[PDB]
Amino acid sequence: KELVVGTDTSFMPFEFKQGDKYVGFDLDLWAEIAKGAGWTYKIQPMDFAGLIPALQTQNIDVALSGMTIKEERRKAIDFSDPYYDSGLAAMVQANNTTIKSIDDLNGKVIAAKTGTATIDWIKAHLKPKEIRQFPNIDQAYLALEAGRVDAAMHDTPNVLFFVNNEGKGRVKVAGAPVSGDKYGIGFPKGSPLVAKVNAELARMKADGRYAKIYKKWFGSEPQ
């Protein structure tokens, strides 16, 4: 069967448009899992908020989106074993001298991405003036650059990647990231693909293929 793989519209460096083509850590990881299992697939780019619902209705067979493993989400969907250790970070304009930690975001206007774990975390741990929601994180960062929000928050590696590439000298990380999150590949509840994905991934980890893909995107070794 030709698998339909839901993939995030834009989540650098996991999935993102480069020229005409989508590339990234999730794409390379999944290509290598698919190859070893003997599966053919097509990807279907879509905004993050649609992926969990598409898994619940069996409209996609797999979701790739640096998807944070959460016990609440396990109620609705199934996860692979973790393949990445992540967290959350605050971004502010290069300009900004007022926001020194994540605690300084109380009372401020924070840009964030609709449907992601970032919103849940803010609601659980901060008392902001406003959470301004954007379907895609690119617009969150634009709203920050334009001075319409005090800060943006999102997954650490996405924030760090923006700050070092497209956002170099316009935005920066404020404070320290909060760590402890893990990513999994998402599947419909009860999917039979899970056990084989797990086995391929344990192999890739044990035999260096995981490390080569990691080194490509993150430069060091090991939503």
Side-chain angles (χ1 to χ4, degrees), residues 1-11 13-16 18-102 104-122 124-126 128-165 167-211 213-214 216-219 222-223:
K1 195 250 195 213
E2 191 167 276
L3 305 173
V4 180
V5 182
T7 61
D8 200 298
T9 306
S10 169
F11 186 58
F14 294 89
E15 293 79 45
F16 63 102
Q18 190 172 59
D20 257 20
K21 296 178 171 45
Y22 269 94
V23 296
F25 181 89
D26 278 351
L27 290 178
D28 289 345
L29 194 75
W30 171 258
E32 192 57 30
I33 295 164
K35 168 165 166 209
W39 299 334
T40 61
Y41 64 102
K42 58 182 155 307
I43 74 163
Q44 176 71 10
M46 56 191 279
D47 293 350
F48 183 86
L51 293 166
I52 294 181
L55 290 179
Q56 290 176 281
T57 56
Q58 299 183 11
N59 284 129
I60 62 177
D61 303 289
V62 183
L64 292 181
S65 73
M67 189 172 288
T68 302
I69 296 161
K70 294 295 196 196
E71 192 53 48
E72 189 67 19
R73 289 172 172 180
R74 277 194 218 276
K75 278 174 197 160
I77 67 169
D78 273 355
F79 287 108
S80 75
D81 289 319
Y83 69 85
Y84 187 81
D85 295 318
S86 193
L88 298 174
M91 188 190 292
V92 302
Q93 299 186 265
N95 196 59
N96 180 292
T97 61
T98 43
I99 296 175
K100 303 295 203 183
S101 54
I102 295 176
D104 291 354
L105 293 182
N106 292 301
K108 301 309 193 313
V109 175
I110 311 174
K113 185 184 174 171
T114 301
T116 65
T118 311
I119 302 306
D120 312 322
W121 189 96
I122 295 163
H125 290 97
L126 289 178
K129 178 168 166 164
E130 179 187 351
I131 316 182
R132 196 162 312 164
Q133 293 201 26
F134 301 88
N136 274 292
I137 195 60
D138 317 75
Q139 296 101 257
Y141 299 154
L142 219 61
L144 181 62
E145 289 185 38
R148 298 294 184 173
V149 298
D150 302 298
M153 277 190 78
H154 206 42
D155 307 52
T156 305
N158 178 255
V159 162
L160 262 43
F161 193 85
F162 192 73
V163 165
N164 292 307
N165 294 281
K168 227 334 164 131
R170 309 146 178 276
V171 303
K172 60 187 189 205
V173 173
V178 304
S179 67
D181 295 324
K182 297 186 182 282
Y183 297 166
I185 300 165
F187 305 91
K189 180 55 79 196
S191 168
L193 302 184
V194 186
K196 221 327 196 164
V197 167
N198 288 342
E200 278 299 294
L201 179 60
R203 269 172 217 120
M204 289 163 64
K205 283 193 170 180
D207 76 22
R209 288 178 290 151
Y210 183 85
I213 298 167
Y214 190 96
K216 179 183 177 194
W217 292 102
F218 300 106
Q223 299 199 108

